[PDB]
Structure formats: C-alpha cells, structure tokens
Design a protein around this ligand. Structure first.
Ligand SMILES: CCCCCCCCCCCCCCCCCC(=O)OC[C@H](COP(=O)([O-])OC[C@H](O)COP(=O)([O-])OC[C@H](COC(=O)CCCCCCCCCCCCCCCCC)OC(=O)CCCCCCCCCCCCCCCCC)OC(=O)CCCCCCCCCCCCCCCCC
Ligand SMILES: CCCCCCCCCCCCCCCCCC(=O)OC[C@H](COP(=O)([O-])OCC[N+](C)(C)C)OC(=O)CCCCCCCCCCCCCCCCC
Ligand SMILES: CCCCCCCCCCCCCCCCCC(=O)OC[C@H](COP(=O)(O)OCCN)OC(=O)CCCCCCCCCCCCCCCCC
Ligand SMILES: CCCCCCCCCCCCCCCCCC(=O)OC[C@H](COP(=O)(O)OCCN)OC(=O)CCCCCCCCCCCCCCCCC
Ligand SMILES: CCCCCCCCCCCCCCCCCC(=O)OC[C@H](COP(=O)(O)OCCN)OC(=O)CCCCCCCCCCCCCCCCC
Lengths: 87, 155, 459, 177, 128, 79, 13, 99, 65
C-alpha cells in the first residue's frame, strides 16, 4: 500500500494532466511554461489547473498557495514539499 | 512578566484605554472592554465571541490545534470556544428555521404516537384462551384458595 | 496506639541525625515501615471496637484513615524531595519535621477516645499545615491562603470548643465509648439548634461545605505538593470523621437540622463540578473536584443511614488516594512547564506515554469507574440518598454526567491533541514520579479485591 | 480577510476563491463526472459573462449577489478531502509527529542503536547553532523600524548563510511518520 | 428571491455575506495594515525565541498569563455590588437552594406521611 | 521504482458520455477543455459496468445450475 | 531498503 | 502573479535544506545496531492448564459450598425414564387427531 | 507476485479473488433458491387465512329473530 512519490513521478503526472487540457498545446508545454505569460491562460484556467491537480493527487491546495503556483515546476515543488518526496 | 502587563481596572479616560489597548497588543479602535457593570472583567477586551473552528485552518498558527497565535489576546471564554467544544460556525440553514423544523418534527411525531396509542391496530381475534382457570396455579395463585371456574368452549 | 505514636516521634531524631544526603532515604524507609506496621489495626470485631486504653481506641472508621495517613507520609516525602533539592539543609529538615509532626497529630486525632483531645489534635493539625503552605508554597498568594485556611477553621472550631465543654459539663464525660451509652435525645429548641450548629459547623468548614469552601481553592492550590496531598487526602476527612463521631449526640434534631446543609451539598456538588468544566488552572480543577466529591460525603453523613456511612467512608478513602494522585500528576507537569495553566502543555501522550497511562487510570478512578472503591462509595451514597428521597437521583445522576465531563476533559486537554511546539523541556518520566503514581494507584486498585476493610464500623 | 503575507484579499482573489468554492460545491451536488463537467462548463460560462466589467462598484455588487447565489446553492455536506480541514483523516497522524528535540532526551544505550543517525544529527545541530547568530543579525539589519510589516521572511542573501528562522520549517515531522 | 441568512448567537454570519467585507476604503486599509503589523511583530517576537537553539524551556506567553490572571485574580478587585450583580447573585445563588429545599421537603413530608399511616408499600425495603 | 505512465494520446472522448456533454455544450456555444482528463473513467476496463439487477444477479447462472442439479439429485435419490 | 527513522520519545525510562 | 523573487529564493533554499534533512533521516545497513540477545503448546498452556485449574477450583472449592453452582433442573417429558429412580414418566393422553 | 499499481486503467486481478467472489455469489443464489424450493411458506405463507364472512350463522350460533 501507499506507493512513494518521486520528483520524476510527480513531474510526469503534472505534465500528464496538463497535456490532457485542451487549452494547452502539448508541444509548447515544458516544466517552466508559465501559465499567464508563456501559455497565455486566464486566471480562471489557473484555478481549474490547480483543482485538477487536487483531483489528481488527492489533497487540497489552499488558495493562498494556489494563487502563486504559476508554472508546472512550482506545482511539482509544492506537491514535493507537502508530501516529503526524496526521503 | 511584571505589574503593568497584568489586567487592571476598567479604563475611563482615553489615555488609560490606549494604554490598555497597547497592553493587550491590539488597536485602540478594535479595543472594546466589557461594560462596566461590576461583573469582574476590568479592562479585558471583549473579543467578538467566535469559536476557534471559524479561524482559518490553512493559516500557519503558532498553536495549530487551538488555531491561535502567540501574543494574541485570547477570548475570555477561550477554554469554552475550543474546537473540542461549542461551535459558532455558519450553518447552511437558518438557526430559527432549524429550531422550528426540529420542534415541529418531534412534536408531530409525539402527537402521532399519542394518536396511534389512542387508536391502536389489532387483529380480528378474541382473547387467547388458557386452560386450568386461565392457568391459576401457574400464575402464582395459592392452592388453598380456589378460583372461580373459567370455562372455554369449542367454536 | 502508642506503638504508632513513638515510631512517628522517633522519625524526628531519624531526620535530624541523618547525613545530608540521607535524610530522604531514611525517612522514606522508616515511614514505609510504620505504614507496614499500620495493618495491625485491622484487628476489628463485628461488635466491639479495638479499645486500646483510656486515651486511644480504633474502630473500623478510624482504622482505614490511619492506614491512609501512615501510608501518605512516604508518598509525600517522594513527591516533595525534588522541588526542595536546592533548599537549605536545615529548612529541608524543618519541612520533613512538619510532615512528621502532622502525621503524629493525625494518628492520634483519629484514635482520640475523648472528644476534647480530639479537638486539641484536630486543631493542632492546623499549625504544620499552615507552616508548610505559607513557607514552602511557591507564589505570593500562599500567605492569603494560609490566612483563609486558618480563619475559616478557627471561626468554625471555637464554637465546637464551647459546645464540647458544654457536653462535658452536662453529660459528665466526652469519652465516645461512654457517650455511646449515655447519649440523651436532643429535642427541638433554639438552644439545641445552636448546640447543633456549634457541634457541626467546624466539620462543615473542614469537609468543606459548599459556601464555606472558599479557603480550599487557595489552600490546595498555593501549597506545595506534600501540602496538597495531606490537605486533599487526610485533612478534609477530619471533618467527616468528626461528623460521624458527633452526630451520635445530635439526634433527633439532625433529622430537621440537616435540611439546609443537604441542599447546600446537593446543589453545591452540581456547582463545583460545573466549575471544574471551566477551570484554566489544573490544580484548582482538582481542588474544586475535591469539594464536589466531599459534598456527597456531607449528604451521606447528614442522612445517617448505614449504606450512607459505608459509602461515605469508602468515598473518603477512595477520594484520598485519587485526589492525592491527581495532585501528584499536576505537580509532575508543573515541575516541567513551571505553570499550572492547563491549556499550556497539551498532547503529552505523544511525549510521555506511561505517564499518560497514569493520567488515564487516575481519571477513571476520578469518574468512579466500577469496580473501584470510588464507584463503591459513590454508588452506596446514591442508593442511600435515593432511599432518603427519590428525586435526589436527578441531582446524583446529573452530577455523574459532569463528573465524567471534567475528568476526561482534564485527560483530553493535558494529554491529547497536538503537543505544544514551543515547550521543549518535557523530560521523560522519572522513576521517582512513576513510583509515586504507582504507590497511589496500586493500593487503590487492590482495595477493590477486599473492600470490606474500608466500609466503616457498620459493615 | 486573514492572510499571512497580505492584509486583505483583493477583489480578483475573492472572485477566484468564490469560483473554486462554487466548483467544489457543484461537484458535491453533481456527483457524476460527465454531469459535473457539463454544469462546470456552464458555470465557467457564467463567470466568463461578467469577466470584462470595469465598474468596480458593479463588479463588487455582482460578486456579492454571486456569494448569495452560492450560499443558497451550497451542499450541506460538501466533499472534503481526507487531509483537508473537516476531513475524515484530517490531523489523524498528529499523535505520531514527535518533535526532533525529544531525540536529545534519549538514553545513550538507545542512541547507540543508531550511531550514524545521531552522528549525522550532530552536524545538523552544529550547522543550526552556527547559523543562528548570522540569521538574527540578518533579521535585525533588514527589518524596518516599528517591527516587521508582513510575516514574510527574507532569504539567505550571502553565500554560506542559511535563511533566517529555518529550523522548525526544515526539521518539521513528516506527514506519515 | 433568495432567503436571507439570519445570523444567531451560536450560528454566526459568514465572512462572504458580511457587508463590511467588501470595504475598499482607506481607513479599513489602515486598520487591516495596522493589525497585520501588530500580528507580524508578535509573530517575529515569538519565532525569534521559538527558533533559538540556546533556549530550552517554555516560550512564555504574556497573553496567556494575562488571560489566566483575568479569569482568576482580577474578578474581585473589579467587582462592584450594584442592582444587576445583587439580583443575579440572589437569583442564581439562593434561588435553586430554596427551590430544591421546597421540592425535597414536600417529597419527604409526603413520604413520611404515607409511611406513618401505613400506606407506602415498604414490603421488602430492609436496606436503607 | 520508475513507473511508466500510459500515452496521453489514447484518451479520446468519442463513444463516451463526454462526447454527449461536448455536443450539448457546443449546442450553446461552449467547449469542454477537461474531457480527455475525465476520459479514462469511461474507457478501458471501467467501461460497460453492470446494471443494478445485473449486480444483484451476480453468480445467478451458476447458482441456478447448481440448484437444478441438486433438485434432480434429490428427485432421483428418493427412489 | 528506504527505511525511515521514526522519531519517538525516549522509551528507556 | 505568483511569488516574488525573495519568496522563490527562500522556498528554494528551504526546499534544499528540507530535502537534505529528509535524506538524512534514512538508515544505515548496519542500523538498528541491536545488542546481542512444541507444536501445539498453545492448546496446552492457554487451554488445557486453565481447564485443569478451573475444574479443580469448581470441584473442590465452589461446589463444596452451597448454592454456588446452581443448575436448572433438567426438563422432564411424558415418556422419560429417570436415572436416579427408574420411574417411567407416563405418556400423554391420546390425541383428538386433527389431520 | 503482489499487485503492481496502475495509472488511469483497470487494476490487476488475481484469479483467486475472482473465482472466490463468483463462488460465493453462486452459493448465495443456490441457498436462496434451495430454501425457497423447500420451505416456500416462510415467504409466501404457511397456512390458509380463512374468510370470516363466509362462515355460517349455524356454526357461530346466531339464532334468527
Ligand atoms: C492481590 C493480588 C492481585 C493480583 C491481580 C492484580 C489486581 C489489580 C492490581 C492493579 C492492576 C493494574 C496495574 C497495571 C496497570 C498500571 C500500570 C500500567 O499502565 O502499566 C502498563 C504496562 C503495560 O504497558 P506497556 O506497553 O508496557 O506501556 C504502557 C504504555 O505507556 C501505555 O499503556 P496503555 O495506556 O496502552 O495501557 C494502559 C491500560 C489502560 O487500560 C484501560 O484504561 C482499560 C481499563 C478500564 C476499562 C476496562 C476494565 C473495567 C473494569 C473491569 C475489570 C475489573 C473486574 C474484572 C472481573 C470480572 C467482573 C467483576 O491499562 C491496562 O490495560 C491495565 C489492565 C488492568 C486494568 C485494571 C483496571 C484499571 C482501570 C481503572 C479502575 C477500574 C476499576 C477498578 C478495577 C480493579 C480490579 C482489581 O503494564 C505493566 O508493565 C505492568 C506493571 C506491573 C503490574 C503489577 C500489578 C499488581 C500491582 C500490585 C502489587 C502488589 C500485589 C501483588 C500483585 C501482583 C500481580 C502480578
Ligand atoms: C465558619 C464561620 C461560621 C461558624 C459557625 C459556628 C456555629 C454557629 C452557631 C454558634 C453559636 C455559639 C456557640 C453555641 C454553643 C452552644 C452550647 C449550648 O449549650 O447552647 C445552649 C445554650 C443554652 O443555655 P444553657 O444550656 O446554659 O441553659 C440551660 C438550658 N435551657 C436553655 C433550657 C434553660 O445556648 C446559649 O446559652 C446560647 C447559644 C447561642 C449563642 C449565640 C451567640 C453566637 C451567635 C453565632 C456566632 C457564630 C460565629 C461567629 C463568628 C463568625 C466568623 C467571624
Ligand atoms: C426514555 C427517555 C429518553 C429521553 C431522551 C431526551 C432527553 C435527553 C435530551 C438530550 C440531552 C443531551 C444532548 C445535548 C448535549 C450534547 C453534548 C454534546 O455531545 O456536544 C457535542 C459537542 C461538540 O460535538 P459536535 O459539535 O457535534 O462535533 C462535530 C465535530 N467537531 O461537545 C461539546 O461541546 C463539549 C461539551 C462538554 C460539556 C457539556 C455540557 C452539557 C452537559 C449536559 C448534560 C445533560 C444532563 C441531563 C440529565 C437528565 C437527568 C434525568
Ligand atoms: C453562605 C455560606 C453557606 C451557608 C453556610 C451555613 C450558614 C447557615 C447555617 C444555619 C442554617 C439555618 C439554620 C438551620 C435551620 C434548620 C430548621 C430551622 O430551624 O428552621 C428555621 C425556623 C423553623 O421554625 P421552627 O422549626 O418552628 O423553630 C422553632 C424551634 N423550636 O425558622 C424560624 O423560626 C424563622 C426564622 C428565625 C430566625 C433563625 C435565625 C438563626 C438561624 C440562621 C443563622
Ligand atoms: C438589592 C439591591 O438592589 O442591591 C443593590 C445595592 C447597590 O445598589 P446600586 O445599584 O449600587 O445603586 O447593593 C447592595 O446593597 C449590596 C448587596 C445587597 C444584598 C445582596 C444579597 C444577596 C447576595 C448574593 C448571595 C449569594 C449566595
């Protein structure tokens, strides 16, 4: 039970959920693709991305932390810090 | 700790109110004391009477179980408004509507139990018939006395 | 009873001639030997009390209080030797001498055949207790607590002195064994009304009665740990002992003098228990719970039925052990966090699991878990008060809700929840502390195997 | 309202938080995934309708009656994540999160069971006690007069320094000890 | 339209349904910023002592000591005997004593009157 | 250790009720940007789940067969 | 492999 | 917008220190360094020896006292034979047959 | 070999859990049908319920006056 998350696995899953989102073309996306500057998304889209991250990994990200995760690497680092990966 | 940081008497002059507000680590505009009716509060602030469940749980508290910071002026009933105890959090349904619905449901159910007790259901049968004078010796009747003959016939 | 008085007095040269590292070990050892010797007082008979001499006698009421008194001294020496470690050597010996002197006064308070000698010992117990509170208490309010403890007691007890000398002049004697046979009925008059008040109000203060209890949440709180142990475990029970000796002479006026005071306890145990729901001071919570438990003993002595006296003496012994262990637990946390505020140190089961098991056991004995003698005394008092008046079960049963609700709250606030982050001096449980908790709890659990020794002269 | 860094929520932040709370309560009302997905795109259209509103009084009014909309249409038992506050497993493992300083209170016969761990703990404690004075003097040389204004902390500005007030963030217990 | 939420003593108003929540006025900005500054100064004062390696003990909280002193020792020096406290002390202090006195007295008078008239079924009652 | 996630290009919402959702959204000028995220729930082995009477009648076929065999066994065994 | 240290209080005493 | 550069730098530095701490919570292959320290015996020690103890206790200490183990007397039917007497209980009266 | 976790797809089933689940489902329906075949009266009724209105006045003793 309870398989341990790694940085590579979390990165794969976050980029995987973002490659299934029809407002992001999956060839322009990288780990540092900023959602408002590089990917050109709405703040509503950023909220929906963080809610899909919550539905993916199973834990709520609070709004004071949700309104600041603006690239996928920030999301991977946040899930890493809140789940203590690479023990 | 020393004398001038302990709670004192009710402030009346605005400089005493300002020194009290500085003592309790809060703004003068937010510092309301209890009304000076002589109940024993003194200069202690009337914090707005909320439970600690309503505090922001994602905020990093100095006391996460209590949802309370260090140096923050505690409510007078802080031991009462802990999360193991009385909650003041906003309810989806209005409080008066909750009271009316629960009282109406309980009173209506007790009224209908009184109605069904007044009008009971039963079966289209007679009484259950027992031999030996409705089992006189079995029910604890004394053998020196003799009951009246209870007789059941065939039908 | 001189075979217990002389060893208790020989504890004085035992502590004043011991070496400076040896005055705790020697007094602990030989006070445990006196406590082992105390079991010879269990030579009790179904009709006759164990009547030693003209001066001393011991029935089945005084005997469990004697065993508890002689057992409490080593436990107080263990509880008090840590916070007096940096104390001066001669003041340390004066502290031990005051505890020894208090044991000496108590063991011939409970065995006093004659009632004015009972009064002299009963009021002689004030002076070591006063000195221990006002000299080795920790805070500023120990002086005011000593004043309250002295002056409620003396304002109660000096009419008792006048009334006992009146009984001496009227009946010719104050021998309890003589007054078992020469007791005259006390009719209805105002003279006999104030006779009853003068005979009862001193013990009403010492129990304490609700409304007269105000000395206790200072005197039990401002004292050191040995002071709180002897105040809770023994010195409240002088009131119940003296009531059970003095209500022989107060019949049949008691049958209508008891009515206000019964109310004062039957409502008062609702109030003080309710007060324990909102105590921020843990040691004050244990003090108010002691008032709440002794209110049942007040009711059981005033209704004067056999089940009531059996439950009252069982509840006195059980509350002695339970409240003594609760104060020792509160001190075991005070020696770490240096504050008696209960909300300060939380989550202590994560840090001290075996000490939290002791907290659990003392809480369960506080809330009268069967088959403990707490529940035996509680239950017999509830039976006798139901036979007294059937409505009282309401005030009994509601009490047994609130008595649970502060006992586990004390267990939840201190031991459960998240631990406090900024407190980092929470040492592991010392062997002395766990020894103290076990020497309270293990006799309290073994007495459920044979409870007939703590059920008074009319078992 | 109540935030560590900011004193308030902006109007934009209030709209975002109402949007997220509305979608979570909608998912609580609209259990199945296709049905939620349909009504969630409809709610996204309802939020896209008044996106370009420049009158701030009108936008604040629309946000207020949208809050009243949400308060009428909320679920009585919304879905809470298990480790979210109000969850079934929320603060469950807090009884297992023993702090690090208790390792200092261990007996040397039970410290000798883990020689490399405590030998490695000693250099963490040494790093902390040599960084402490540098980070205190970093905090006092950078905090404005009258005390700090926000609860944010500066980072380590020099090479070799550690960020100020770092020990009880780094050495916090794990979520599953 | 929609039913308005009616807040009560034990069910307070939500943060989002309070009309003072949407204040963009500069005086509320000053109040929120000053509360932020007080809270940040108290936070910094806490976690300087909380993160200290040399400190081994209890970070004392004068708010907590102040709260316990107000709950315990400040009550009588800020008491005044007036109309309100006298009526509440007579209503809550001797009122229930009078009430339970008359209840238990009437009950025991009725029971004793039944017993000495041979009316109470006391057939097997020999434990008392 | 290293887990291989499947391809993201295999999750297409045609044939699923997400297609019906997207058609009813395009009927009023909307588009569904989270369809392929939810597409795996309606595909693979989690597609074609049973009905409720099919849930209750799990194993009814073999139970009926064993019933008929046992009734025939006691109908012959009495003779 | 990947065994983690369990911070627990002193169970010696 | 998201983080300030000071917040990103502080979270990166705290993240590096946190990952070093979590890595340093691992174990050595020698750790924990421990100090140097009949098929159906459960049916003998936990069952059969208690049946022995309890049978001795009930036979020679409990049943030797009156009314300690009081058994309900066994049920007697028409047509039985008593073991202690031999007295055959007479059978019932002939039935008014109903079917 | 124990079960490996999978991502966005149906998990690995063991043969044993499938055959035991189907076996106890078939056991349930066998028991329901078997006891329904044999008892058949705890559900549908043990004895016939007589109609009181079809009873004659002669057997109940109602003399006509
Ligand atoms: C005369 C000979 C007599 C011999 C028989 C003994 C009679 C009773 C004596 C006293 C018994 C209690 C002593 C042990 C517990 C206290 C210390 C402790 O917690 O240790 C944990 C520890 C084991 O835990 P651990 O994992 O190592 O560490 C603890 C953790 O930190 C944390 O641990 P934790 O929190 O996980 O676990 C604590 C747990 C907490 O458990 C609970 O809270 C559950 C208990 C309450 C609910 C269930 C019981 C309710 C009542 C029913 C039972 C009584 C009647 C049963 C009979 C049938 C019905 C009538 O405690 C228990 O489970 C203890 C089991 C026994 C409980 C007895 C009742 C205590 C409850 C409160 C009072 C109830 C009314 C009075 C009953 C009196 C009966 C005589 O135990 C020991 O190491 C044992 C130490 C040595 C014990 C000596 C016992 C005898 C003492 C007297 C000496 C002199 C006479 C010679 C007799 C010698 C016999 C060998
Ligand atoms: C803790 C604080 C409260 C303490 C309360 C203490 C008890 C309250 C009542 C005490 C009354 C005084 C002692 C009575 C002794 C009775 C002995 C006796 O034989 O009485 C019959 C005798 C009767 O006289 P006699 O017995 O000599 O006569 C022969 C008998 N007859 C009467 C039939 C002819 O009573 C008296 O002489 C007077 C008794 C009443 C005394 C009233 C004065 C004192 C008032 C109460 C003071 C209460 C404490 C004050 C301090 C409070 C704190 C500062
Ligand atoms: C056959 C007859 C049948 C009769 C049935 C009807 C009669 C009884 C009517 C109901 C009375 C009891 C119910 C009311 C009290 C309930 C107290 C309680 O459990 O409160 C729970 C509360 C917090 O729990 P909660 O908020 O639910 O948890 C959510 C998760 N955070 O917890 C807290 O806030 C902690 C509070 C601790 C202190 C409680 C103080 C109140 C105690 C009330 C005692 C009442 C005694 C009545 C005696 C009657 C005698 C005859
Ligand atoms: C505040 C802290 C908590 C309290 C601590 C305890 C303090 C109070 C202690 C004393 C309590 C009251 C005294 C006990 C009352 C017992 C019954 C009684 O005497 O009732 C009063 C009396 C009843 O009348 P009756 O019985 O006819 O008297 C004639 C007697 N031959 O009634 C009357 O005759 C009318 C009243 C007359 C005045 C009596 C004054 C003396 C008693 C109170 C002092
Ligand atoms: C009665 C009454 O109104 O007393 C008020 C009086 C002070 O009057 P004030 O309101 O200051 O004008 O206050 C006073 O005169 C002092 C108190 C009057 C007597 C109160 C008696 C009952 C007190 C509580 C007893 C609890 C047991």
């Amino acid at each position: 039970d309870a398989p341990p998350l790694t940085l590579e696995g979390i990165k794969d899953r976050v980029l995987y959920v973002l490659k299934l989102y029809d407002k992001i073309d999956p060839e322009k996306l990288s780990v540092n693709s900023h959602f408002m500057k590089d990917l050109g998304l709405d703040s509503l889209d950023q909220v929906e991305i963080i809610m899909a991250m919550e539905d993916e990994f199973g834990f709520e990200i609070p709004d004071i932390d949700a309104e600041k995760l603006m690239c996928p690497q920030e999301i991977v680092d946040y899930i890493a810090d809140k789940k203590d990966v690479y023990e | 700790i020393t004398k001038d940081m302990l709670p004192g008497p009710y402030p009346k002059t605005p400089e005493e109110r300002a020194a009290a507000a500085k003592k309790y680590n809060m703004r003068v505009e937010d510092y309301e004391p209890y009304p000076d009716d002589g109940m024993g509060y003194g200069d202690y602030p009337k914090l707005p009477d909320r439970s600690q469940q309503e505090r922001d749980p994602w905020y990093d508290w100095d006391h996460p179980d209590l949802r309370l910071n260090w140096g923050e002026p505690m409510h007078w009933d802080l031991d009462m408004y802990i999360r193991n105890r009385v909650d003041t959090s906003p309810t989806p349904v209005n409080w008066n509507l909750m009271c009316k619905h629960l009282f109406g449901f309980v009173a209506f159910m007790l009224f209908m139990f009184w109605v069904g007790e007044t009008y009971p259901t039963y079966q289209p049968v007679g009484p259950k018939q027992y031999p030996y004078n409705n089992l006189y010796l079995e029910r604890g009747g004394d053998p020196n006395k003799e009951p009246e003959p209870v007789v059941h016939y065939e039908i | 009873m001189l075979k217990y008085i002389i060893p208790t007095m020989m504890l004085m040269p035992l502590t004043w001639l011991s070496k400076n590292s040896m005055i705790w070990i020697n007094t602990t050892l030989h006070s445990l030997l006196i406590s082992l010797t105390s079991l010879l007082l269990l030579n009790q008979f179904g009709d006759n009390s164990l009547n030693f001499s003209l001066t001393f006698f011991s029935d089945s009421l005084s005997t469990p209080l004697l065993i508890l008194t002689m057992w409490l001294l080593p436990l107080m020496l263990m509880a008090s030797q840590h916070h007096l470690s940096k104390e001066n050597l001669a003041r340390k010996k004066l502290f031990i001498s005051m505890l020894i002197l208090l044991q000496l006064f108590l063991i011939m308070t409970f065995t006093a055949t004659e009632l004015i000698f009972f009064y002299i010992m009963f009021e002689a117990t004030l002076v070591p207790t006063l000195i221990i509170i006002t000299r080795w208490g920790n805070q500023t309010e120990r002086l005011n607590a000593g004043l309250y403890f002295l002056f409620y007691t003396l304002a109660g007890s000096l009419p008792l002195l006048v009334a006992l000398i009146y009984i001496q002049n009227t009946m010719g004697s104050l021998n309890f064994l003589i007054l078992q046979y020469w007791v005259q009925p006390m009719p209805n008059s105002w003279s006999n009304t104030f006779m009853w008040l003068a005979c009862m109000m001193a013990f009403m203060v010492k129990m304490p009665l609700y409304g007269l209890h105000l000395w206790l949440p200072k005197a039990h709180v401002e004292a050191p740990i040995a002071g709180s142990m002897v105040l809770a475990a023994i010195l409240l029970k002088l009131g119940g002992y003296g009531m059970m000796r003095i209500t022989l002479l107060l019949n049949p006026i008691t049958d209508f003098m008891a009515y206000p005071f019964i109310m004062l306890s039957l409502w008062g145990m609702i109030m003080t228990s309710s007060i324990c729901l909102r105590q921020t001071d843990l040691k004050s919570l244990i003090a108010y719970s002691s008032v709440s438990h002794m209110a049942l003993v007040i009711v059981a002595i005033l209704i004067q039925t056999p089940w009531s006296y059996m439950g009252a003496t069982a509840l006195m012994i059980a509350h002695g052990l339970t409240s003594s262990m609760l104060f020792c637990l509160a001190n075991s946390n005070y020696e770490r966090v240096h504050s008696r505020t209960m909300i300060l140190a939380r989550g202590l089961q994560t840090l001290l699991p075996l000490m939290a098991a002791w907290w659990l056991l003392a809480s369960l004995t506080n809330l009268a878990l069967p088959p403990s003698i707490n529940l035996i005394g509680e239950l017999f008092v509830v039976m006798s008060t139901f036979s007294w008046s059937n409505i009282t079960i309401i005030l009994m049963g509601l009490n047994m809700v609130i008595t649970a609700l502060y006992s586990l709250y004390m267990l939840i606030t201190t031991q459960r929840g998240k631990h406090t982050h900024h407190i980092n001096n929470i040492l592991p449980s010392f062997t002395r502390e766990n020894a103290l908790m076990s020497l309270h709890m293990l006799p309290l659990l073994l007495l459920s195997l044979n409870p007939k020794i703590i059920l008074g002269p009319l078992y | 309202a109540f935030l560590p860094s900011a004193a308030y929520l902006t109007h934009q932040q209030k709209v975002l938080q109402l949007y997220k709370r509305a979608l979570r309560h909608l998912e609580s009302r609209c259990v199945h995934r296709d049905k939620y997905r349909y009504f969630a795109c409809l709610l996204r259209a309802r939020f896209d309708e008044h996106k370009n509103e420049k009158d701030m009084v009108k936008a604040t009014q629309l946000l207020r009656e949208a809050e009243k909309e949400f308060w009428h249409g909320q679920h009585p038992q919304p879905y809470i994540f298990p480790e979210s506050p109000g969850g079934t497993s929320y603060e469950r493992y807090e009884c297992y999160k023993v702090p690090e300083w208790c390792l200092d209170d261990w007996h040397p016969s039970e410290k000798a069971m883990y020689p490399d761990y405590f030998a490695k703990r000693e250099q963490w404690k040494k790093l902390r006690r040599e960084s402490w004075e540098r980070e205190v003097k970093q905090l006092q040389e950078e905090t404005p007069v009258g005390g700090p204004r926000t609860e944010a902390l500066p980072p380590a500005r020099k090479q070799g320094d550690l960020p100020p007030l770092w020990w009880h963030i780094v050495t916090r217990p794990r979520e599953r000890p | 339209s929609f039913p308005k939420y009616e807040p009560s003593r034990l069910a307070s108003l939500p943060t989002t349904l309070d009309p003072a929540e949407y204040d963009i006025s500069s005086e509320t900005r000053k109040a929120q910023a000053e509360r932020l500054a007080i809270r940040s100064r108290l936070k910094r004062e806490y976690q300087l002592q909380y993160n200290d390696p040399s400190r081994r003990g209890v970070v004392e909280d004068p708010a907590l000591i102040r709260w316990t002193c107000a709950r315990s020792a400040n009550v009588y020096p800020n008491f005044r005997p007036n109309t309100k406290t006298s009526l509440l002390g007579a209503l809550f202090g001797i009122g229930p004593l009078i009430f339970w006195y008359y209840v238990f007295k009437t009950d025991r008078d009725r029971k004793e009157k039944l017993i000495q008239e041979g009316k109470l079924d006391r057939t097997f009652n020999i434990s008392y | 250790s290293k887990m291989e996630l499947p391809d993201y290009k295999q999750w297409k919402i045609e044939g699923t009720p997400l297609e019906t959702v997207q058609e009813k959204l395009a009927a009023r000028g909307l588009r569904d940007p989270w369809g392929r995220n939810e597409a795996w729930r309606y595909m693979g082995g989690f597609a074609n789940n049973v009905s409720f009477v099919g849930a209750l009648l799990k194993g009814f076929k073999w139970g009926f067969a064993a019933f008929v065999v046992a009734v025939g066994a006691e109908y012959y065994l009495e003779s | 492999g990947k065994r983690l240290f369990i911070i627990k209080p002193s169970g010696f005493y | 917008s998201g983080y300030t550069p000071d917040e990103k730098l502080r979270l990166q530095q705290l993240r590096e220190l946190r990952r070093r701490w979590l890595k340093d919570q691992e174990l050595s292959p020698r750790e924990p360094v421990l100090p140097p320290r009949r098929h159906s015996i459960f049916a003998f020690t936990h069952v059969l020896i208690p049946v022995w103890i309890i049978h001795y206790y009930l036979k020679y200490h409990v049943t030797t006292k009156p009314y300690t183990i009081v058994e309900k007397k066994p049920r007697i039917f028409p047509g039985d034979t008593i073991l202690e007497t031999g007295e055959v209980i007479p059978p019932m009266k002939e039935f008014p047959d109903q079917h | 070999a124990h079960i490996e976790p999978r991502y966005r797809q149906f998990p690995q089933l063991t043969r044993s859990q499938v055959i035991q689940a189907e076996f106890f489902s078939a056991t349930m329906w066998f028991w329901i049908l078997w006891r329904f075949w044999h008892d058949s009266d705890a559900v549908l009724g043990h004895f016939p319920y007589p109609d009181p209105s079809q009873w004659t006045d002669e057997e109940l003793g109602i003399p006509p006056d």
